[PDB]
Ligand binder design. Structure first.
Ligand code: A1BJR
Ligand code: CL
Length: 167
């Protein structure tokens, strides 16, 4: 039993809700919140901009030190950093950005990072400003993630479309 409330169950391990991931993280304080990161951990907009803003820029400060030490992530890769006031940990995961020409096949690799954590609160990778089809992202999530994932979808119209079209 966990504290996630109001989710629709899609499969044995995948759950979905129309919610603002920032507000969901602040309420649940999950062990892991997933950020829709880029390789530079520059949290300017989309989910990343919103999560970072909610940490009063502490996420960005920590991220800049991480990059200065380690260099950029790989597309499809991830790193674990602090969750600040939102979660115990933040798993920064880089899905391919279609608006940069990146291979959509890398979306499966990106979701594989979730399997290193038993339970996660997450957005749909590569959705929103990353330019991929969210219906496809949900399909890859369900077919790749085996651990327990709670998906927060900000847009109500999109949430209803994802549920109604789910096979
Ligand atoms: F300021 C922002 C900007 C983007 C998001 C945000 C707050 N909170 C989010 N929570 C979950 N998923 C998100 N990204 C996808 C976009 C379409 O539906 C889901 C966002
Ligand atoms: Cl977005």
């Amino acid at each position: 039993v966990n504290s996630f409330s109001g989710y629709l169950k899609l499969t044995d391990n995948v759950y979905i809700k129309n919610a603002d991931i920032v507000e969901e993280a602040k309420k649940v304080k999950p062990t892991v919140v997933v950020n829709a990161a880029n390789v530079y951990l520059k949290h300017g907009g989309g989910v990343a901009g919103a999560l970072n803003k909610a940490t009063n820029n502490a996420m960005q400060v920590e991220s800049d030190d991480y990059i200065a030490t380690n260099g950029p992530l790989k597309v499809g890769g991830s790193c674990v950093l602090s969750g600040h006031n939102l979660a115990k940990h933040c798993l920064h995961v880089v899905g391919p950005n279609v608006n940069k020409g990146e291979d959509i096949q890398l979306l499966k690799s990106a979701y594989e990072n979730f399997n290193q954590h038993e339970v996660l609160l997450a957005p749909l990778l590569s959705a929103g400003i990353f330019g991929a089809d969210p219906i496809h992202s949900l399909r890859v999530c369900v077919d790749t993630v085996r651990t327990n994932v709670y998906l927060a979808v900000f847009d109500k119209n999109l949430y209803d479309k994802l549920v109604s079209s789910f096979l």
